[PDB]
Design an enzyme around this catalytic site. Sequence first.
Site, PDB file in Angstrom:
ATOM      1  N   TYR A   1       0.832  -1.195   0.000  1.00  0.00           N
ATOM      2  CA  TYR A   1       0.000   0.000   0.000  1.00  0.00           C
ATOM      3  C   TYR A   1       0.869   1.248   0.000  1.00  0.00           C
ATOM      4  O   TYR A   1       0.623   2.196  -0.761  1.00  0.00           O
ATOM      5  CB  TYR A   1      -0.943  -0.028   1.211  1.00  0.00           C
TER       6      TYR A   1
ATOM      7  N   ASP B   1      -9.537   9.609   8.154  1.00  0.00           N
ATOM      8  CA  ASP B   1      -8.223  10.179   7.866  1.00  0.00           C
ATOM      9  C   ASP B   1      -8.437  11.684   7.741  1.00  0.00           C
ATOM     10  O   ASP B   1      -8.972  12.157   6.726  1.00  0.00           O
ATOM     11  CB  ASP B   1      -7.653   9.606   6.569  1.00  0.00           C
TER      12      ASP B   1
ATOM     13  N   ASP C   1       4.284  13.312   9.627  1.00  0.00           N
ATOM     14  CA  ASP C   1       4.404  11.981  10.204  1.00  0.00           C
ATOM     15  C   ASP C   1       3.020  11.427  10.518  1.00  0.00           C
ATOM     16  O   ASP C   1       2.227  12.081  11.203  1.00  0.00           O
ATOM     17  CB  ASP C   1       5.331  12.039  11.411  1.00  0.00           C
TER      18      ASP C   1
ATOM     19  N   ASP D   1      -0.954   4.783  10.120  1.00  0.00           N
ATOM     20  CA  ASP D   1      -2.212   4.160   9.740  1.00  0.00           C
ATOM     21  C   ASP D   1      -2.383   2.824  10.454  1.00  0.00           C
ATOM     22  O   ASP D   1      -1.439   2.036  10.573  1.00  0.00           O
ATOM     23  CB  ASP D   1      -2.299   3.836   8.244  1.00  0.00           C
TER      24      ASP D   1
HETATM   25  C1  LIG Z   1      -3.923  10.781   2.335  1.00  0.00           C
HETATM   26  C2  LIG Z   1      -2.537  10.729   3.000  1.00  0.00           C
HETATM   27  C3  LIG Z   1      -1.646   9.751   2.238  1.00  0.00           C
HETATM   28  C4  LIG Z   1      -2.137   8.313   2.322  1.00  0.00           C
HETATM   29  C5  LIG Z   1      -2.322   7.857   3.724  1.00  0.00           C
HETATM   30  O1  LIG Z   1      -2.279   6.663   4.009  1.00  0.00           O
HETATM   31  C6  LIG Z   1      -2.589   8.891   4.716  1.00  0.00           C
HETATM   32  C7  LIG Z   1      -2.731  10.191   4.417  1.00  0.00           C
HETATM   33  C8  LIG Z   1      -3.192  11.163   5.464  1.00  0.00           C
HETATM   34  C9  LIG Z   1      -2.485  12.512   5.398  1.00  0.00           C
HETATM   35  C10 LIG Z   1      -2.536  13.091   3.990  1.00  0.00           C
HETATM   36  C11 LIG Z   1      -1.851  12.130   3.017  1.00  0.00           C
HETATM   37  C12 LIG Z   1      -1.648  12.720   1.608  1.00  0.00           C
HETATM   38  C13 LIG Z   1      -1.060  14.137   1.593  1.00  0.00           C
HETATM   39  C14 LIG Z   1      -1.886  15.063   2.495  1.00  0.00           C
HETATM   40  C15 LIG Z   1      -3.299  15.298   1.930  1.00  0.00           C
HETATM   41  C16 LIG Z   1      -1.355  16.459   2.770  1.00  0.00           C
HETATM   42  O2  LIG Z   1      -0.707  17.138   2.006  1.00  0.00           O
HETATM   43  C17 LIG Z   1      -1.780  16.864   4.163  1.00  0.00           C
HETATM   44  C18 LIG Z   1      -2.436  15.618   4.778  1.00  0.00           C
HETATM   45  C19 LIG Z   1      -1.886  14.480   3.913  1.00  0.00           C
END
Ligand SMILES: C[C@]12CCC(=O)C=C1CC[C@@H]1[C@@H]2CC[C@]2(C)C(=O)CC[C@@H]12
Lengths: 129, 130
Positions: free
Chosen positions: B16, B40, B100, B103
């Site tokens: 993933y 999330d 940081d 998940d």
């Molecule tokens: C979607 C995501 C990646 C996949 C994953 O497993 C968990 C996350 C949560 C934080 C996300 C991130 C992608 C990039 C994001 C949108 C930002 O630029 C700020 C918050 C962050």
Amino acid sequence: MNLPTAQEVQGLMARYIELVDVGDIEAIVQMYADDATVEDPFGQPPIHGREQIAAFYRQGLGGGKVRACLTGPVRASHNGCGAMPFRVEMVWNGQPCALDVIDVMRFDEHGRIQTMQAYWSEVNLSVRE
Amino acid sequence: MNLPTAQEVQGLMARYIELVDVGDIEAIVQMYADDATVEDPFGQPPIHGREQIAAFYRQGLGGGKVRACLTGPVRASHNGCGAMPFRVEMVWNGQPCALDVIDVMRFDEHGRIQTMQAYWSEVNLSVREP
Ligand SMILES: C[C@]12CCC(=O)C=C1CC[C@@H]1[C@@H]2CC[C@]2(C)C(=O)CC[C@@H]12
Ligand SMILES: C[C@]12CCC(=O)C=C1CC[C@@H]1[C@@H]2CC[C@]2(C)C(=O)CC[C@@H]12
Ligand SMILES: [Cl-]
Ligand SMILES: [Cl-]
Ligand SMILES: [Mg+2]
Ligand SMILES: [Mg+2]
């Protein structure tokens, strides 16, 4: 303390690691709400309340020869929850070993631990090869 | 694949991130269950609906300049669950940044992500040294 903010969660979760690192059972158990649960490892039956949680930390820790250390920052929410990666050092088959663990902890309004869930298994246990 | 073994968790979760980092939206959305949920960040209400989840990855990754890598081992359970620590890199407010995250996932007997919860908040955001 009210419901911990992100910042408070990070502090509370760091503190909890030291207290495992130094084996202070009464100060750990006091971090848990009176009616908290432990699942450790997640997948095992939960444990309920301070009596059953002190019996757990005294089994796991009471014998000594257990150190712990955060292996990155505490991730923290705005609802009173956080999660952290750390390493345990202890003895397996008369020799040192490392166990890599993640705990997720939900806090109540009062700054204590309502729920703890510890994600590890044998795949996360390492030795000298 | 049926629940996945712990060793197998581990594979589904490293794969993933590998996918997240490459930016393959449709590969990412397929790893899920028809009825999966995403939370999330944890605490914001679940989304649900394959389309509600592609748009999630489309909003989040659709520039192509997100990167993501495990920053330590996946921790896996014997009941189809795992947890993992990783570091997201992206530009925000014109600054090189990093986030940081941890998940937590569960899966299904068929090895499809059933739930996901991403732990992080603004306390985990920082600026990368030059
Ligand atoms: C979607 C995501 C990646 C996949 C994953 O497993 C968990 C996350 C949560 C934080 C996300 C991130 C992608 C990039 C994001 C949108 C930002 O630029 C700020 C918050 C962050
Ligand atoms: C209870 C504990 C520490 C506090 C914590 O939060 C998570 C864990 C899980 C792994 C435990 C460990 C304590 C030491 C244990 C009992 C061993 O020697 C084998 C497994 C390991
Ligand atoms: Cl980390
Ligand atoms: Cl780690
Ligand atoms: Mg110490
Ligand atoms: Mg209470």
